Ligand binder design. Structure first.
Ligand SMILES: Cc1cc2nc3c(=O)[nH]c(=O)nc-3n(C[C@H](O)[C@H](O)[C@H](O)COP(=O)(O)OP(=O)(O)OC[C@H]3O[C@@H](n4cnc5c(N)ncnc54)[C@H](O)[C@@H]3O)c2cc1C
Length: 404
């Protein structure tokens, strides 16, 4: 067959469809979308949107007419099974489709809070437009929310809930916030900023039970035995890559759908991109899964480029960002295994960067309200070039000249 079937119409799904057309792909392109919304943006969900008037499709990538003009078949359905041998995609509507090449961009789903009463009505998640909209409408009728999970999303939400007048308590099991993604100097800064806004941070604890009265949430019980009163709970304790269906078809999976340097599964005719993909990284010499718009986007481009001619190893350089309250956090590079951190700028001035090193080499830059340092990293890191810790701290050391 000639048709390219895309399962999942989020960032990666939408981008591969678009990039496929830009590259003048002749075949048919079907985009399976299991949500009652035109493909939309995720980043605004825990940011601006929570502050908007809730405009139905204000987060749409492109308007409805776009998919028609682009010959991208937008199918309002969901894949449930994959017939690799018959190269057919089995939808839930009962329908079935043959494919030349199958692109899996199923992303990842919320990991359910595994605690008593965790499923009461007032225990909400925050990852889909729908979930964002209910939370937006629910906050005005709530006085106190406990946020479980100090990840990016949880804090982006916490600041807004606080800004709206709600009482806010953040529950994190680790000793500091964003422990899975940033170095201590960043956690510290944000701990101060949020605390300063009146948000009460709680470290070293897990939720062990959701205290309720009738079926009304009244608090969150912690592993230290104490209970934090609240009438609303927002949980962000991780996701689960959607690999089930692919695994059901015999495709290797783990913490994501396994793919090689070219984002291909063990079955040619089937690729995996975005949050759902556990790819082989030539640059970093290891298999990993990355959750970011950058990753979804660059991976989509890589596949689109392959299915149209030049098959190259995926090498989208990783970078992320987060908008918490009035502060902007930008990260370029992977900081895992950092053994030396240098501060450039001033924490007091609320504009600085943490230059992270490992074995004497710059591995990443975490910039708070300092776009210039981020541009420096985005240019230098992909080239695998570095700057000494001494130079990073020196405000008289010109980053523009260094990156020319
Ligand atoms: C609230 C929020 C804020 C974020 N903010 C940022 C940010 O500021 N910066 C950043 O870099 N990243 C951010 N991210 C992460 C970013 O959204 C993800 O990295 C990106 O969406 C991953 O793209 P994706 O295409 O793989 O999957 P997603 O966008 O999640 O889309 C997956 C889509 O596939 C659908 N689907 C799943 N299974 C099936 C199936 N079997 N059949 C059909 N359809 C299916 C899903 O319902 C969904 O619509 C944020 C994420 C969230 C949730």
């Amino acid at each position: 067959n000639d048709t390219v079937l895309i399962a999942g119409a989020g960032h990666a799904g939408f981008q591969v469809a678009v990039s496929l057309r830009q590259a003048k792909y002749p075949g048919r392109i079907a985009l399976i979308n299991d949500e009652k919304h035109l493909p939309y943006q995720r980043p605004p969900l825990s940011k601006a949107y929570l502050k908007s008037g809730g405009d139905p499709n204000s987060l749409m990538f492109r308007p409805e007419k776009f998919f028609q003009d682009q010959a991208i078949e937008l199918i309002s359905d969901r894949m449930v099974s994959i017939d690799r041998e018959g190269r057919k995609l089995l939808l839930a509507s009962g329908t079935a489709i043959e494919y030349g090449h199958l692109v899996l961009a199923t992303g990842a789903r919320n990991r359910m809070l595994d605690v008593p009463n965790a499923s009461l009505p007032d225990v909400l998640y925050l990852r889909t437009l729908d979930e964002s909209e209910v939370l937006r409408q629910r906050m005005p009728d709530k006085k106190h929310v406990v946020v479980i999970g100090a990840g990016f999303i949880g804090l982006e939400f916490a600041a807004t809930a606080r800004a709206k007048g709600l009482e806010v308590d953040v529950v994190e099991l680790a000793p500091r916030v964003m422990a899975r993604v940033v170095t201590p100097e960043i956690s510290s800064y944000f701990h101060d900023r949020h605390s300063g806004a009146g948000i009460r941070m709680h470290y070293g604890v897990r939720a062990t039970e959701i205290a309720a009265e009738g079926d009304r949430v009244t608090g969150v019980v912690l592993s230290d035995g104490n209970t934090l009163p609240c009438d609303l709970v927002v949980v962000g304790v991780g996701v689960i890559p959607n690999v089930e269906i692919a695994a059901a078809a015999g495709l290797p999976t783990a913490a994501g759908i396994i793919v090689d340097q070219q984002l291909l599964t063990s079955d040619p005719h089937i690729s995996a991109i975005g949050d759902c993909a556990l790819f082989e990284s030539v640059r970093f010499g290891e298999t990993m899964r990355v959750e970011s718009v950058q990753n979804a986007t660059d991976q989509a481009r890589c596949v689109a480029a392959r299915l149209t001619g030049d098959a190259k190893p995926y090498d989208g350089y990783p970078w992320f960002w987060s908008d918490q309250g009035d502060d902007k956090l930008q990260i370029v590079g992977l900081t895992a295994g950092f053994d030396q951190v240098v501060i450039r700028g001033s924490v007091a001035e609320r504009s600085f960067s943490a230059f992270c090193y490992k074995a004497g080499k710059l591995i990443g830059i975490e910039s708070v309200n300092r776009a210039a340092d981020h541009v420096f990293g985005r240019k230098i890191l992909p080239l695998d070039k570095s700057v000494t810790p001494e130079q990073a701290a020196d405000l008289s050391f010109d980053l523009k000249k260094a990156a020319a």
